[PDB]
Design a protein around this ligand. Structure first.
Ligand SMILES: CC(=O)N[C@H]1[C@H]([C@H](O)[C@H](O)CO)O[C@@](OC[C@H]2O[C@@H](O)[C@H](O)[C@@H](O)[C@H]2O)(C(=O)O)C[C@@H]1O
Ligand SMILES: CC(=O)N[C@H]1[C@H]([C@H](O)[C@H](O)CO)O[C@@](OC[C@H]2O[C@@H](O)[C@H](O)[C@@H](O)[C@H]2O)(C(=O)O)C[C@@H]1O
Ligand SMILES: CC(=O)N[C@H]1[C@H]([C@H](O)[C@H](O)CO)O[C@@](OC[C@H]2O[C@@H](O)[C@H](O)[C@@H](O)[C@H]2O)(C(=O)O)C[C@@H]1O
Ligand SMILES: CC(=O)N[C@H]1[C@H]([C@H](O)[C@H](O)CO)O[C@@](OC[C@H]2O[C@@H](O)[C@H](O)[C@@H](O)[C@H]2O)(C(=O)O)C[C@@H]1O
Ligand SMILES: CC(=O)N[C@H]1[C@H]([C@H](O)[C@H](O)CO)O[C@@](O)(C(=O)O)C[C@@H]1O
Ligand SMILES: CC(=O)N[C@H]1[C@H]([C@H](O)[C@H](O)CO)O[C@@](O)(C(=O)O)C[C@@H]1O
Ligand SMILES: CC(=O)N[C@H]1[C@H]([C@H](O)[C@H](O)CO)O[C@@](O)(C(=O)O)C[C@@H]1O
Ligand SMILES: CC(=O)N[C@H]1[C@H]([C@H](O)[C@H](O)CO)O[C@@](O)(C(=O)O)C[C@@H]1O
Ligand SMILES: *[C@@H]1O[C@H](CO)[C@@H](O)[C@H](O)[C@H]1NC(C)=O
Ligand SMILES: *[C@@H]1O[C@H](CO)[C@@H](O)[C@H](O)[C@H]1NC(C)=O
Ligand SMILES: *[C@@H]1O[C@H](CO)[C@@H](O)[C@H](O)[C@H]1NC(C)=O
Ligand SMILES: *[C@@H]1O[C@H](CO)[C@@H](O)[C@H](O)[C@H]1NC(C)=O
Ligand SMILES: *[C@@H]1O[C@H](CO)[C@@H](O)[C@H](O)[C@H]1NC(C)=O
Ligand SMILES: *[C@@H]1O[C@H](CO)[C@@H](O)[C@H](O)[C@H]1NC(C)=O
Ligand SMILES: *[C@@H]1O[C@H](CO)[C@@H](O)[C@H](O)[C@H]1NC(C)=O
Ligand SMILES: *[C@@H]1O[C@H](CO)[C@@H](O)[C@H](O)[C@H]1NC(C)=O
Ligand SMILES: [Ca+2]
Ligand SMILES: [Ca+2]
Ligand SMILES: [Ca+2]
Ligand SMILES: [Ca+2]
Lengths: 394, 394, 394, 394
């Protein structure tokens, strides 16, 4: 076993094909399936796995009550093979966690899970299933991380964490690890900016991240760094906003440097992703501008380098009549594709229950997963498909 | 690990012995078992697996409602070890799919799954669990494939797809792939003929397929091709019809070149199989001439090359008092048998629920599997065995 | 991987220690566990597994109705790791079967499963999970086999089958196989004798079997054969009867050559076992002389060679207040113990439900497993422990 | 595969980070999860596993009735991957047992399980899943062992057993084994002392144990021995009592040689642990002095060598509003951490049901697991989290 290089360029793709759908909530109507949220996908040398944060409870059980809540001592990071439901008997325990990231360095799985009190949380780093290191909260205000795959290159793994207020200036740090031990860290200077839940991927030896601004920006922060943790930080240049909530495209003017907000879009957001394509960008977003409803992906011409409004392609993978949620990025390594470039993929979370469906006592989500291909691919609507309310709701 | 040659001659067999029965519907009365249809079997170098198309729902759950429907965003191709029920906790996810084929090239599993809208569907090709290629609908009319094992030889895997009307002239293509990438394709010219759901197997370096004509033929199309995708196409010569619906044998006259229909048999059919045995043929068929009821296999003397009505052997594996369904072919490679020829096997789908059992809200199936042996083997009736209606039906 | 020699002498043991208890019926009150009977244990180079014949149905489900019946198209031979319940999600499918035997030759698992109609049944031989050969009924009267482990030596595996009447002269054959192919067979001449459900084990290069006489004998037949299938056949000499039903010891006179019966013991029996210990024998038997109740093991001095009534040791592993059933023998190979002799072990089936517990609609069993050790070991009573009736019974 | 040395010094740690939480009782409200108690953790070269003693029954089933009872024929030692619930479908059977210990020598798992009658119990030793040896009760009074991991060094595995009265002078023995065979034993002379349920770990080639005195001591016995089973025995010197029940710290005076009791603390106790840290000690204890409620860990300066009352650090991992239970020690070997010292970890059992929660008919527990790290780590309260009563209680 050797470390994955992961220093190849990201593939240029013209479409995204569906790779997986777990149907977890449909199955959990009768089967034994965890209540979850914040699913994400990460790939090792031989397989991809779906990670998720459980609520330490099963669907259609009384312990699923009040699972709209984000943090508790019962949440854990677990994983299943890609496409499996997050069920009670296949789930592999990874970390105690109400916020997490995970990735594979070519030799072993790395998992970073945060638990503890809001004012004194800490991350536990697991490597090959063994606890190796700890990262303590440095601002004592809900230490939190990506909720998606971290990035490994040449035996080093990288991820981004945040600590501080949800709706004002916070603190943002990049971490570097080797075999589960933190070997470097760097605080990112981003005055007036806000970074949470970064979706990161490798591209030609650098880590490129598209994040969530939960403060004054309806545009997404972009963070790019190298092995030294030297970084560039700013916003996705595109004159098309991709956070939620946001305003209509015609009411928006892009910026590469500043958070663009107002119009009732401040103080919230949703985890999302984007992939640089030379000077252009593939960016995902909810179809609704106000709620987590529907999902589409847009190819914006020169959207990575200028405030372009030119949409070259648009593909819908979930219609606006269905609930979406978080979305995130990962890549498929060369050891699985035998290609000369890294394949960009994304996953989509579809949230059911509270708060949008008030007649249910619980909140969970299921997922779909898509990977980039060299040709155009039609869209459709692959919705969660569960029929609510459930038995436990009655 | 090396590629399977699979260029040996097909074994001549004198009987078929039962190898597996999953009892999935019986088990799913209480256990957690997927609602499925279109099961099939494929074998790798070390094991055989049962593949199936789920309805993204479990038996005896409310989401099993209306599962007589053929296509939805919730259907997925999954697999279990041969003989296991298609249950929620052993199932391995293979592809999002409402139509599929799969096979093993000696190194990795290949899975081809079709999803999307009827007028813009696409196949995603998975190799070793990774998405590798895509095949788009070329006629924009329900792109569809075998619902049985594809065929791999010398590292190349082959399968047949159809696109176009269900009850008139459609378009038929053969595909060739290597390591999950399509490397060749060929459209089959078959005017007045109709090809769907091919059951294919290797025989002396060629792929031989016995298919379903859903148009004007109660006889089965035969398609034979080589590595160049050079092909011969026609109908099973035997003066014994093996599709359903069909007419009584005495009312039928065979043809090697033309679809023989009429008498209320047009515009429907069922997936079935046959194995060439020199100039003769082993062919399966339902016992009923009008419905998917019962199952028998016939050895027809010279039935591959002329309109023979001579039945040398007949074996019943399901009596006419029980529901059958699709049936398909696969082979066991030399790496498992240490033989000098490929062993022909078939599986039988037994459908329960709609439309034949109207008091149930759901439709699923279970399977039995049989393999050819060098001596005669008695038949019996290995029925599904489930007692309907189920709890959810009441 | 190499073939197991298995030609070492059987160990002399002074006691039996409990190794496993599956608690399957207790667990199946809520868990998803197969209705079974005829469990047995067989060991490979790296692990022991519990085999069992399912009824193709789960405990506490409606399909468990009428499972007192012995043969149906829904019964299958499956296996789980030693000590696991025979549950729906760990069970490995081995063969379609209402009678079976299985063993490991050092390289692969061999499974022999009989199915089909009573008057035309056939055994399918599975090797490494692949169907390899078939053995047809030669008397057309319920072809049947050991319901316990077969014996493998130097790459050859051996087992005993019976065909013919249950309560009069039948036909008995020994089979030899290599890599799943039958390579030799021998009919055993045993006029006035009856052989069923042999419990066999290797001892110094010979196969020694202790069987069930379902005709005129309350003493157990003994069958001993070598690689040529040259055999000796007779009865366990001991002046202590070990079948059930039987008479009190004081009313019994042993015989090495003749079936000893009468006194209302004719025409029934139970599968049981014994281990030669030089000239002595360890023999199991129910505590009750009339029903399958309780279980004890006796060491009878010189009981293998003469009509001795001398009991050197007696150990009870199930008191007479609890239901027992079949029992059988297996051995642990040298590759697991690193010893110079083969370790004798037995399993005990504990039957619950019909016919002894009439208020239940079903019949199943659980098991305990014991292995011989060089010192004396106390007994106890490890009963099934399930509380009947179950929910489905009400 | 080679034997683990395990002769390195124990790491000096400044804090304990949470590694795992199984949420088994919460999950078992709907999922199929064993009723258990006495969980513990042991680590092999490649993974850690959670062991537990089942009651041969599942949560929320009628067979969970009266599971406050400690010994029955239905209890078994089983294991799951660290962090998994003790569920019916992942559980690996290890031994029949109502008292147990287990550990990994670098090549195979060793499990020691005690069953049988109170007055004639015996331990069965399992090695690599095979029964290898037996240890009989020598005082005929509930032979019993650690209920936590044993210790392996250089291919030899060590554990402590007790036989005799629960509330007066008993007999205590140390055992040494190689490949599952007992190779040495030593009776420990400890007049006026009482030893049960030792928590042991390797430290610089010696085994150090912190145990439970169920007689006259509210301080914990300490037992230290080498490969020859030469031992030192006494009590934890610290002037801080760590058993339960106990008195307030201010009312306690420590002793290195004598049991310190009285004040209503006699004749009971709870399994607990401690780790030597040079001359100091990390010791766990319930927060309540009278019941198994809450849990904290204390670093006591020079507490291993003198009657110190100096508490350098205190960390709470379960508040006093929640039920705790047993706790135990294990270490992580060098093969997983690549360190030069052994990492100390502990697990905590959280008991729900009888006798503290009288409205439930059952008793079970779940667990949390913590490992030592080189820096201080905040505490929190990771409680069991189940909402009682359960369905079966009503
Ligand atoms: C899944 C779904 O129903 N999506 C709806 C969405 C949600 O119902 C809503 O966003 C939840 O708050 O509603 C949307 O319609 C937008 C529209 O709704 C009118 O009622 C309102 O007057 C308008 O101001 C505007 O919000 C949406 O697009 O988000 C439609 C979507 O289909
Ligand atoms: C499983 C089963 O019941 N099979 C039946 C079959 C089905 O009931 C039927 O095909 C569903 O449409 O019925 C069959 O009988 C054939 C016979 O039925 C008469 O009622 C009718 O008048 C005739 O024209 C003819 O269809 C059949 O063979 O298919 C019998 C079979 O047992
Ligand atoms: C598990 C159990 O209850 N075993 C009983 C056994 C069974 O009840 C019985 O064999 C089922 O048919 O009963 C036994 O008692 C033997 C005794 O019973 C008397 O009622 C009868 O009059 C006598 O002839 C004789 O059968 C038995 O030993 O088999 C007792 C056992 O505990
Ligand atoms: C989980 C929990 O409720 N823990 C309680 C504990 C238990 O209720 C109790 O120990 C069970 O017997 O109670 C404790 O309070 C201690 C206190 O209780 C008074 O009622 C009593 O008068 C005092 O003598 C004393 O026992 C405890 O600390 O153990 C509190 C704890 O929160
Ligand atoms: C650690 C944590 O609580 N994460 C939560 C975050 C934060 O609340 C926001 O990022 C503001 O910081 O977002 C969610 O609430 C959300 O938007 O659905 C869910 C997620 O669990
Ligand atoms: C892709 C698809 O819909 N396949 C379906 C086909 C087509 O309807 C026919 O082949 C006509 O094209 O056959 C079925 O309906 C059938 O006969 O039971 C089931 C199957 O799922
Ligand atoms: C193949 C078969 O039916 N085997 C059955 C046999 C035969 O009936 C007898 O051996 C007489 O031949 O014994 C049982 O009935 C029994 O005693 O419990 C169970 C077993 O399933
Ligand atoms: C073998 C056995 O019965 N062990 C039991 C012990 C003994 O009763 C005591 O150590 C006294 O010997 O402790 C418990 O009762 C307890 O305190 O919860 C549980 C445990 O199962
Ligand atoms: C969920 O919580 C609410 C608030 O306590 C309660 O009223 C309701 O009964 C709970 N639902 C269930 C099924 O536990
Ligand atoms: C992607 O496209 C850009 C812009 O044309 C090009 O510079 C780059 O080389 C491409 N990358 C790959 C991997 O082909
Ligand atoms: C199935 O669907 C029909 C039609 O909508 C509906 O009447 C029926 O209640 C459904 N059955 C169940 C159990 O959901
Ligand atoms: C099968 O039988 C045909 C016709 O006799 C013969 O030509 C062919 O060689 C046989 N094939 C095999 C594999 O034996
Ligand atoms: C079992 O079978 C009998 C006889 O047909 C029937 O009366 C009874 O209802 C069945 N029990 C169940 C629960 O199916
Ligand atoms: C078992 O005991 C018999 C009788 O003493 C003896 O002949 C034989 O050698 C022994 N076998 C073994 C394996 O020790
Ligand atoms: C538990 O045992 C008690 C005492 O026998 C009994 O009263 C109660 O019904 C039992 N509970 C259940 C659900 O079996
Ligand atoms: C732990 O600390 C003690 C006391 O300072 C010291 O003697 C010992 O060397 C340390 N052990 C390790 C493994 O560092
Ligand atoms: Ca925002
Ligand atoms: Ca037709
Ligand atoms: Ca008899
Ligand atoms: Ca005490």
């Amino acid at each position: 076993p050797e470390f994955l290089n992961n220093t190849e360029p990201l593939c240029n793709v013209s479409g995204f094909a569906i790779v997986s759908k777990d149907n977890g909530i449909r199955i959990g109507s009768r089967g034994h399936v965890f209540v979850i949220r914040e699913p994400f996908v990460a790939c090792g040398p031989t397989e991809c796995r779906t990670f998720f944060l459980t609520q330490g409870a099963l669907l259609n059980d009384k312990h699923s009550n009040n699972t709209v809540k984000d943090r508790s001592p019962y949440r854990a990071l677990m994983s299943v093979p890609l496409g499996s439901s997050p069920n009670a008997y296949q789930a592999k325990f990874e970390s105690v966690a109400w916020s997490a990231t995970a990735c594979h360095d070519g030799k072993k799985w790395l998992a970073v899970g945060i638990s503890g009190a809001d004012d004194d949380a800490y991350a536990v780093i697991h490597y090959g299933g063994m606890p190796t290191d700890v990262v303590r909260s440095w601002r004592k205000q809900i230490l939190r991380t990506q909720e998606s795959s971290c990035v490994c290159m040449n035996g080093n793994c990288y991820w981004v964490m945040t600590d501080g207020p949800a709706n004002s200036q916070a603190s943002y740090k990049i971490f570097k690890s080797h075999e589960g031990m933190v070997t470097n860290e760097r605080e990112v200077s981003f005055q007036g900016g806000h970074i949470e839940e970064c979706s990161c991927y490798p591209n030609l030896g650098k880590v490129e991240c598209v994040c969530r601004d939960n403060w004054n920006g309806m545009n997404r922060p972009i963070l790019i760094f190298d092995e030294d943790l030297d970084y560039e930080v700013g916003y996705l240049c595109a004159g098309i906003p991709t956070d939620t909530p946001r305003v209509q495209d015609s009411s928006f003017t892009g910026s590469c440097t500043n958070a663009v907000g107002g119009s009732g879009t401040n103080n919230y957001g949703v985890k999302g992703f984007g992939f640089r394509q030379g000077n252009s960008v593939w960016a995902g977003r909810t179809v609704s501008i106000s709620s987590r409803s529907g999902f589409e992906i847009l190819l914006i011409e020169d959207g990575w380098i200028r405030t372009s409004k030119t949409i070259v392609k648009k593909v819908e993978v979930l219609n606006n009549k269905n609930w979406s949620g978080y979305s995130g990025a990962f890549t498929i390594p060369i050891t699985m594709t035998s290609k000369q470039c890294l394949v960009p993929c994304f996953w989509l979370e579809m949230i059911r229950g509270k708060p949008e469906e008030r007649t249910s006592i619980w909140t969970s989500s299921s997922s779909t997963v898509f990977c980039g291909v060299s040709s155009e691919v039609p869209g459709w609507s692959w919705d969660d498909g569960a029929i609510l309310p459930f038995d436990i709701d009655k």
